[PDB]
Design a protein around this ligand. Structure first.
Ligand SMILES: Cc1cc2nc3c(=O)[nH]c(=O)nc-3n(C[C@H](O)[C@H](O)[C@H](O)COP(=O)(O)OP(=O)(O)OC[C@H]3O[C@@H](n4cnc5c(N)ncnc54)[C@H](O)[C@@H]3O)c2cc1C
Ligand SMILES: Cc1cc2nc3c(=O)[nH]c(=O)nc-3n(C[C@H](O)[C@H](O)[C@H](O)COP(=O)(O)OP(=O)(O)OC[C@H]3O[C@@H](n4cnc5c(N)ncnc54)[C@H](O)[C@@H]3O)c2cc1C
Ligand SMILES: O=[S@@](Cc1ccccc1)c1ccccc1
Ligand SMILES: O=[S@@](Cc1ccccc1)c1ccccc1
Ligand SMILES: O=[S@](Cc1ccccc1)c1ccccc1
Ligand SMILES: O=[S@](Cc1ccccc1)c1ccccc1
Lengths: 411, 411
């Protein structure tokens, strides 16, 4: 009934807090102080859809639900190749229930505070193998929940579940104040720039209050792979506006008076999508279990990492509670991951990895048809809450045409 | 905020009770009295796994949880072709959480009583088109939850989702007292008789207390398609013992003193697996929405119909609550079904329909390997709680060999 978790992030803290509430003793390692997280760089755009939000609600952890702006739909626009400044696709659909984006700079430090208040043992150290060897002698189970930290590479890359070994997009985030609110409802406003990349923007809550988060993804080497020469926050804001002016002038109209929320409300980087084997064996021969981004890491193009992290921690918590006094051996660890992967994450991952590649004709047809077939637009919007619902019609041309027909018949 | 439901069965009553608890007005049509259901023929073997049981718990509807025997694992046996009376495969695995089988003869009438007590309007009539036309003028939404009743055929068969148009098994149930309990834990004891059929048995709760339910499925025309000449309860019990004596003598050893729980604790029949389109249009042009077995009907070989019914009613209830004052139009109806189908039921249905066909070599290899690889046996057992977790390794030979390797590595 003693659990150790290395890494104080979304999944690790959600799990630790749920374990404490169930009467477990929990040790957690953090490599940063709460205040340094609050005031440091942004980490995510963390748009969480209703199913993930509800996992938090059910643990009593939705502390910002009233203050965080709701995200009430999804929109998709595509520039018109033959009409300057216009869109050839431009539609939106309401989400059946609101999404919300609460800055991890707010959430993770507040959850660290709650974790201590509820009796967790928070240990401050940049943990390595030595700490894992110690934890595995004093605890019944040790999890690594370290996200994109270097220690995550202790787990073996799963080549068969990882089609990519290089970054597929150049990423940037810009948190801003002063953006014209979307009317008549808020949305994830997605912009697909063929052969170039993607821009998405939606309202969120950060450390200085409500904002909007601009999310940029660029095909590497293309016109939106444009962050290498950006060296200051001012240059970052300027490059953000330049992208909108150049590729999505309809969005630039909302941005005449935007400012950064704070100089650390910016990010640029890239990584290869990666799936890893969940059980790592230490030099001693003892074993540790990987959680969330340690074992399933996706590009943010589908906005699923934090959703995955909440759903992964829920599955792992349920598995721990069901195990009782049973051994937390490698078999149990593997079966816990397997339920997450085969039951859910394989479909999130396959969908995301397909979207990173150039869209085949049947996908462009789906995106266009959604603008004239509102049930299909709704299927797209609410698929973000459970990407299993995209299969098999998103990936297969013949199935896509059947689903368009089903949607048109009830429009 | 007025909902009508035609058919007082598992899904219809679960949904109606959840709607009443959320403040809706609910009208329900039943074609039988509660007492006639209690004392009539059995309808199911209704083995419900933990996720389905939890849906009921969360609605406060688990009224028999303490009295119903738990089912704590799954076992699989296959007769040895070259050793008389022996098994070439014989293994078991524990379920991570208990399953339970509460006779629908107990549950449905008790839930009808609760439905009235909680303010539902229970109307007694064999409902037809006229009642649906009336309901759709006086209610905001009308659902058909009539199971295998004739009115279910109002919904159009979905040929593309229905690979079969004929029964694939001859079915029978026998509820008995006096069976030797399984030691050291209870289980769904499955017996696969190659080219002949399947026998499964597990403990349950019926109207005279704890029992075991014998479940027989026979390839049509084969040795276990053997119920046509059975005309009395005594002949039914005798034919049940004959199957065990002939094909599974190890199970017959537990059955030396079995008796029927009651003369109506028997069933024999068959049906074609069928998927239907969820929106039916009445002569008036008004529309009704199908629920559970009306739109997704599977053979019982995987024991999923009641599980599907609980999960379907949960999805539909969530969709209704999220809709608020939004129109309950055909688009919303279709999207509600689509989330159930693409998110979940398509995988239950594909798995079940594959199992009805003769097993390919890689499946026989999986079943044999599970006897020597306990993590793989556990994957099989707990897959019954969420059949999504069988994909893609159950259906594809190359993926099956990868998963066997994953399991063996942590054994
Ligand atoms: C640009 C960007 C945009 C995104 N947008 C979205 C979005 O809109 N929606 C969405 O759902 N997801 C989004 N994500 C993904 C989401 O942010 C992550 O998937 C989520 O944070 C995963 O949670 P986790 O618990 O696995 O890791 P994290 O929350 O990253 O936590 C890991 C923690 O462990 C710490 N750590 C690392 N190494 C060690 C060590 N050795 N010892 C101790 N601590 C250590 C790290 O510092 C970090 O604090 C986005 C990601 C990026 C990069
Ligand atoms: C032999 C057998 C064994 C099974 N074993 C299992 C098992 O182990 N595990 C499992 O999970 N599932 C099992 N099932 C499946 C499970 O019993 C059903 O899938 C489940 O009952 C579906 O619930 P439902 O609400 O859709 O329909 P039901 O529970 O069948 O309810 C439909 C109700 O509507 C009534 N009705 C019909 N027509 C009308 C009308 N015109 N007006 C009013 N009322 C009407 C019917 O009389 C019935 O009472 C089994 C099924 C069979 C046949
Ligand atoms: O992370 S962005 C995905 C993206 C889109 C466009 C340009 C960059 C990134 C997101 C967030 C929530 C829901 C959907 C998308
Ligand atoms: O309905 S039986 C399936 C079956 C097996 C063997 C012979 C007949 C039928 C069941 C119940 C719960 C879980 C698994 C199987
Ligand atoms: O990839 S296309 C457009 C796009 C996707 C994600 C972020 C930005 C743009 C898509 C759009 C909606 C639903 C599924 C896929
Ligand atoms: O169809 S085979 C054997 C069998 C299945 C179902 C009812 C009786 C026997 C199987 C066994 C376990 C898990 C998946 C498939």
């Amino acid at each position: 009934k003693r659990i150790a978790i290395v890494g104080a992030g979304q999944s690790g803290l959600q799990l630790g807090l749920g374990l404490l509430a169930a009467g477990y003793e929990v040790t957690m390692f953090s490599n940063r102080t709460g205040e340094d997280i609050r005031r440091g760089k942004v980490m995510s755009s963390q748009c969480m859809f209703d199913t993930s939000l509800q996992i938090e609600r059910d643990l009593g952890l939705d502390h910002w639900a009233s203050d965080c702006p709701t995200v009430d739909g999804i929109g998709l626009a595509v520039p018109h190749p033959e009409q300057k400044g216009a869109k050839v696709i431009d539609w939106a659909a309401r989400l059946n229930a609101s999404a919300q984006s609460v800055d991890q700079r707010l959430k993770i430090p507040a959850w660290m505070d709650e974790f201590q208040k509820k009796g967790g043992e928070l240990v401050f150290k940049d943990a390595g193998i030595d700490e894992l060897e110690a934890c595995t002698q004093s605890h019944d189970l040790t999890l690594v929940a370290s996200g994109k930290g270097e220690i995550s590479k202790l787990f073996e890359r799963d080549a068969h579940k990882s089609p990519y070994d290089k970054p597929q997009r150049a990423l940037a985030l810009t948190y801003v104040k002063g953006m014209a609110p979307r009317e008549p409802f808020s949305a994830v406003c997605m912009n697909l720039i063929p052969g170039v990349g993607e821009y998405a923007v939606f309202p969120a809550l950060t450390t200085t209050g409500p904002c909007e988060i601009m999310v940029f993804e660029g095909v590497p080497g293309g016109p939106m792979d444009c962050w290498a020469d950006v060296k200051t926050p001012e240059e970052h804001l300027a490059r953000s506006k330049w992208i909108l002016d150049t590729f999505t002038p309809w969005e630039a109209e909302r941005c005449k008076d935007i400012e950064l929320t704070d100089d650390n409300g910016i990010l640029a980087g890239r990584f290869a999508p990666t799936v890893r084997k969940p059980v790592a064996t230490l030099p001693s021969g003892r074993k540790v279990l990987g959680l969330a981004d340690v074992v399933v890491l996706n590009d943010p193009i589908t906005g699923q990492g934090s959703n995955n992290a909440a759903k992964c921690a829920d599955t792992y918590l349920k598995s721990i509670l069901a195990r009782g006094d049973g051994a937390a051996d490698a078999a149990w660890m593997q079966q816990t991951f397997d339920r997450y992967w085969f039951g859910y994450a394989q479909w999130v991952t396959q969908w995301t990895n397909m979207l990173l590649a150039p869209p085949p004709p049947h996908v462009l047809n789906l995106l266009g048809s959604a603008g004239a077939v509102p049930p299909l637009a709704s299927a797209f919007a609410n698929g973000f809450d459970d990407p299993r619902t995209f299969f098999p019609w998103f990936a297969d041309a013949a199935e896509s045409e059947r689903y368009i027909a089903t949607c048109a018949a009830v429009a």
